[PDB]
Amino acid sequence: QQRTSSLYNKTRQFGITAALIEILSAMSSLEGNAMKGVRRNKFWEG
Amino acid sequence: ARRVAEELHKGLKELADYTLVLKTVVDRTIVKGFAVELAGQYVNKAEGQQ
Amino acid sequence: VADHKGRVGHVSQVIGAVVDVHFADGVPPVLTALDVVDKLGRDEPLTLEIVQHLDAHTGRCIAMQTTDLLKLKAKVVSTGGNISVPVGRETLGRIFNVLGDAIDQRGPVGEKLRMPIHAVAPKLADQAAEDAVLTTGIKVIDLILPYCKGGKIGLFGGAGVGKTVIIMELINNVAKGHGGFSVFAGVGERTREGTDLYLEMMQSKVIDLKGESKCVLVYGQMNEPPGARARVAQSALTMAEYFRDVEGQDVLLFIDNIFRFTQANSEVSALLGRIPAAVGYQPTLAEDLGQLQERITSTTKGSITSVQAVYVPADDITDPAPATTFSHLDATTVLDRAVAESGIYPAVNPLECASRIMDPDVISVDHYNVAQDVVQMLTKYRELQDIIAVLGIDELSEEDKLIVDRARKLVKFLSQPFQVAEVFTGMTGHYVQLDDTIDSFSGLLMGTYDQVPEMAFYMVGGINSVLEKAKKMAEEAAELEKMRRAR
Amino acid sequence: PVADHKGRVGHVSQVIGAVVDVHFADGVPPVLTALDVVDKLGRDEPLTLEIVQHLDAHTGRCIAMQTTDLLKLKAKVVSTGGNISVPVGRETLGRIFNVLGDAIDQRGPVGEKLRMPIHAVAPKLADQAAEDAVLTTGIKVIDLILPYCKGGKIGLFGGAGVGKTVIIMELINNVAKGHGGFSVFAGVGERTREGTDLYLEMMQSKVIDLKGESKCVLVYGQMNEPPGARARVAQSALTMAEYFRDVEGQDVLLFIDNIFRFTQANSEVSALLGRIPAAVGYQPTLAEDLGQLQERITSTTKGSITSVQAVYVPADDITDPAPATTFSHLDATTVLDRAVAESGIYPAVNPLECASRIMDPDVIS
Amino acid sequence: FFKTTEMIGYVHSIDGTIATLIPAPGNPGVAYNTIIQIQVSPTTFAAGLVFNLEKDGRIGIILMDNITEVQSGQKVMATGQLLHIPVGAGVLGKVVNPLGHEVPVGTLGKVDTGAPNIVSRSPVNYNLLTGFKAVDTMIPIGRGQRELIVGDRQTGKTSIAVSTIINQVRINQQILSKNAVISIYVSIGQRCSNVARIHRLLQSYGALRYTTVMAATAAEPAGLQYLAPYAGVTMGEYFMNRGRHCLCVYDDLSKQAVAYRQISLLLRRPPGREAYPGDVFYLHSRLLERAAMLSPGKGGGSVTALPIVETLSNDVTAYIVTNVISITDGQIYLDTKLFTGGQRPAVNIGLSVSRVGSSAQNAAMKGVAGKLKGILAEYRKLAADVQTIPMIRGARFVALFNQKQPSYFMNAIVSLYACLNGYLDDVKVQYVKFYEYLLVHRDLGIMYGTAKNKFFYMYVQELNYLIRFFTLNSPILHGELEEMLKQHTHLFLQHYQSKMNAIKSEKDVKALKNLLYSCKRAV
Amino acid sequence: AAKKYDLFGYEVDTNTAPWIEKIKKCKYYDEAGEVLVNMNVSNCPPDIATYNATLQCIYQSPSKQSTPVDNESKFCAMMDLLEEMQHRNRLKPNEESWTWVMKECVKSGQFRLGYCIQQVMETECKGCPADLVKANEANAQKAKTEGKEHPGHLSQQAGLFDVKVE
């Protein structure tokens, strides 16, 4: 009971980490592939 | 190269009214011969290192 | 910008099955259908469906066919509306695809009307209360989780537990004699399974090519791109809605598999610039499924009896997709792999199934009482099984062993050979009446058949078949005894 | 012949960790090309870069083999006219080398006849061998359950402090010393002291005769080395073995410790290169990198290479992508378990999880 | 009269095995999923596949060959056509790449075709003999079927598929070429040496005459590993659309997904579960849907698929493993514990299933399989929960399932029938294989001069087709079949088992042990 | 005469006369299978007559192909063809088909297969051509005189430790 509980508490920690990393690697990709276009503003007016 | 360019120009119907111009480019990948590109049509008559 | 029919645009981006289209006059409304008129040397036409508006001129779309040989700046023409599918009795006996085009090579179909696949779901005021039992001829379903006419049924299960077989059995038992029409929607499943269904229906005369058919088939399968698999269910559902409203008929709607609709939308979600949710599904999982499910309902005009097969990935019923579908059903049939591995078919776990009409007001009091007693006995038997493994069968009391002996007969008596699984089982199927099932279980609970051998209840129909099998078991045992006696 | 890009001049444009971008006015040299930083920069040692990607027609991304300290933008860089080449031949026997092929034994010049690039193509199908035979190691578990194959590929998967290094030394003592052919020891991301102990051991056993003929070559890029070197030392050591196998038709032993650090090093640079990580955090090209490296470690019709590679299992998780991908590239697999060692059993081999390819009656008795 | 290509742009960036292209202003443009040629020299080109078409005009390219020669700034020409590879009977016995280039050893088919329509198929009713009793009885395989082979590393996933290919050699030599089974073995991400060993193994049994190999070794770029299954099946679709049957083996799809993941991530595709791309299910789905059994109207040809999949610690809950399982019509699960337990092939019958059923079994095998299935089911439960007949015969059936080489149909069916009808009840479990060896490779009745049968003898290999036509339980063959078994049993028990049970000497004991173990690897 | 329909209800071509003529003009019987393949592709399923012609070509053909094929057997090919016809096409072989098989068994000297085919004709058909039954018996008794009734290695006495298990 003390050996299977540790593997259960160790598993939930890994499961949470893997998911959040996986979500936050698909958020970086979306941000990286996207970029800001040419800035159309009155640059001289400054 | 000019002769080949003219022949390609004749083949292209879209460029019938367009005036032919030649622009030379240096490619280090070819040691001998020449290549001609016009409106995407590419003709290779060149050789490189053996 | 009211009528966008014939409006022209140009392809601006192509990544996988997702295509961006630029219109100078303004992007058409969402869910609009577009055709790729440009001649790209393709063997099949290319059609797109708008899903998003990036700006006042650009629109993101999903293709229904493969995007091969598609170039940038290719010309695109709007169709003036959403994807339209034919409706009416002229579609009966025919096979269609997501776009509503016949693929049976059986000649043109005479369509008098077409309807968009995208429609608004019925409101609260358009809900009809129909509490009537549906007799499927199956002991387990009719007893523990009886089905309701005009209601929603889910078959949750893994891979290889028997979801498809049960659907075939339901069709053979409910559709052949159905007064109304039937619609089968294959979604992201094996193509051969659809072929077998088509042959069986023709043999059963449900689809009478020379005469009059009473069923429609709509197939978008694995081979198809995700765009098709995400709309085939809407197409079939639109056909059923027309039969419900315009024809005022009671229709059957079989769907296999509804999970593929969610899976397909997840595949395209990444390319639409949407951050994945937990597990990896799209954030719009609950809303997209809800809109579709609410359309599958019985209104004051007509009734739709829906049977949907749900795939529980890796036998994990905690997965977002299977779980989200539980609240959109009136009767859930949960299949378990362990039950199947023990030779019990259908591999139903009665302790996890549920039904809305399991109330004395709707069903007979005897039916309700028998079902509850069965469930309680099964629950108790499982607790005892833990004891039987630690202490052993000897240690159990007189009362406990009687529960064990009776419960084991219940477990085996729930099994039933289907008429469609004769090849799998090698024995003829049985169709058990509702009354026979109730009486048979009622007698078993009170010990009327305590002396019957346990195996006599395995893969049989009503009580009569149990007695016949017991008699056959006795005869063969006597022959073995005689053979031993001579030795 | 002479490369058409030798002497080409570029300028540093971006510096991030061990990854440096170089802009060449006349055009970025070919990938895998070697570059040298000319500016003094007050550094204590020279700076060398290897091109790995092309950002554009003029800009190229590179990994530094040494630390990038005191490196400024606009620093001048000169192409060497070719990939990173290392010495080959009998002149290298009895010597210690680094990733760049420079001798670090503080002894006389190598005086090699020629040099060969580290990056090379692997043997093709028609150049593969079909000889199966048993290499007797003297260890009961290996010789019985998972016998090793001469000229084959052997892997020792294990955690931290399980016995991977000990078994390698035992194999070296029981095989390499009594070996007719040559031997190459590739230290990759391992303790520096172990190399020193091995060097002393090889001198005492006279496998390295400082005054006579030697049979062993040492190539060491250790933990202290930056990721760039740890990702290429294996290639250089493998290149030397390839020369002995082919150019001389000589049997070779190749002891690599540890191969996991090679994949780990490529992961560190990949993060800096701006690549989307795969599962766990490894580079998406994990399988390809191993495939290119391992396929070169094979026995051809000209010669034979018997390779023994130590594999480190991070956190004792044998499902990690790095060790997991390595199973398919090994003829013999030797899995070590920590629990077995804690029971006093050494070696800690777990026979149930071990395997061999010559476990066939057609080969063994 | 010039060989004018279609230049579409230049090479901008290179990242390993993939690249990006910038189109030159005012050029025709390239089409999606088409092949392009990167001019590495005025006479040399490197192949690439279009994968992305971005708003900026940049193009994502998957390189296939001559990667080392690719540099930024080189010219790119567009062929404007999808991928087509050579197909025909002239490729059999050869090793090729996914691009069709032949690999030296020591008609054009489109790779992106669509699967057959629903009405273009027919029910699976023709068996495909693997040669293993366990599979052929409890896990029927029919032509036009997709049968996954899932297991752990070093469990026989490759050996069983190779044996299945080999088992067709003897059959193809006898029957007409119409019903011959061609083989397409696809190696993906495997070692080059293993391919050569497989090539030699096939050549030794003469299977190259009916087999071709498509290899994408580990050293090769991910693009080739990604296209190998599609190119391999394309070579197999040539025979399907011409009234012939084929068998495509994929070893293995697990490494294909890794290659696809590598390509997608490098080309800036959003990752999904386990970093795999979102459309990873659709990859295998369209690959395996192309394997079908065409209807009589289209020729009756078929393609049989045997994709192979690797698990970790017998975990079938993985991502790609689950997706493939939900696609195929059945699965053969090779269990590590059984493999180390001496059971080889380590087929776990409980976890294995074939959704085609008995329809993919010959009329002769139907009766034997149906009754055999019930006995084993009881045998599993009896031991789980007393020398009853089901328990006596169940153990002997298990012992008969141990094999090393594919077995001829006549030999296998006869042995199963004998164990089914109790002829082996008096035979000890340890001696079952020895009993089978004598039955097949010997004839006790002739040895002891007690054989009165007219035609039914195990040395008459031509009886296989008569058995496959009439069934064993038919009056033509049943009478002599029982007589032969009765004589063989009586002679075996009298002359062999009695002596075997009387051995006590260490030398004799050791000799017997070697014999029985050899009999396992012989029959 | 009467239109035939396939599994899905589509019609099939029934004019299978030209294909039979093509079959009757082949040199090696493996080429006959190619004709059958073409027939199926053209949605012209073979009839009973076509299969009989194929059997005739097998019996009258010199060999399977121009070049020899190892372990080739005319009897095996014809039996497999019958298996396809009866099982996968639902057509009962007639007397003519079995007679061709019996002729091949007699011609090839395989006198044990002739006995089995003899019973098959006596069971399904009405007896056997008495000419062929007598011919088979003559071949069998020739083997008895020459001693080739069974392969010799089978007759060799063996023992528990006298058997070579390869």
Ligand SMILES: Nc1ncnc2c1ncn2[C@@H]1O[C@H](COP(=O)(O)OP(=O)(O)OP(=O)(O)O)[C@@H](O)[C@H]1O
């Ligand atoms: N065969 C053996 N007999 C006795 N003790 C051993 C044996 N192998 C290993 N050990 C013990 O385990 C310790 C660690 O062994 P080793 O140096 O081989 O580790 P390793 O596998 O190289 O791990 P790492 O290199 O990551 O530290 C040794 O110092 C010794 O105490």
Ligand SMILES: Nc1ncnc2c1ncn2[C@@H]1O[C@H](COP(=O)(O)OP(=O)(O)OP(=O)(O)O)[C@@H](O)[C@H]1O
């Ligand atoms: N039926 C069998 N009986 C005995 N040994 C077998 C049998 N099938 C395979 N083997 C042996 O088992 C080992 C593994 O077989 P195989 O190469 O087919 O494994 P695999 O599934 O391909 O594993 P991997 O490809 O990951 O190495 C080999 O040594 C092979 O000879």
Ligand SMILES: Nc1ncnc2c1ncn2[C@@H]1O[C@H](COP(=O)(O)OP(=O)(O)O)[C@@H](O)[C@H]1O
């Ligand atoms: N009633 C049944 N009796 C026996 N076996 C069954 C039955 N239903 C399903 N099976 C088993 O399951 C297989 C069919 O699985 P299927 O219905 O396609 O499940 P799913 O679609 O959930 O994977 C059959 O080949 C058989 O092995």
Ligand SMILES: [Mg+2]
């Ligand atoms: Mg199903």
Ligand SMILES: [Mg+2]
């Ligand atoms: Mg160490």
Ligand SMILES: [Mg+2]
């Ligand atoms: Mg393998």
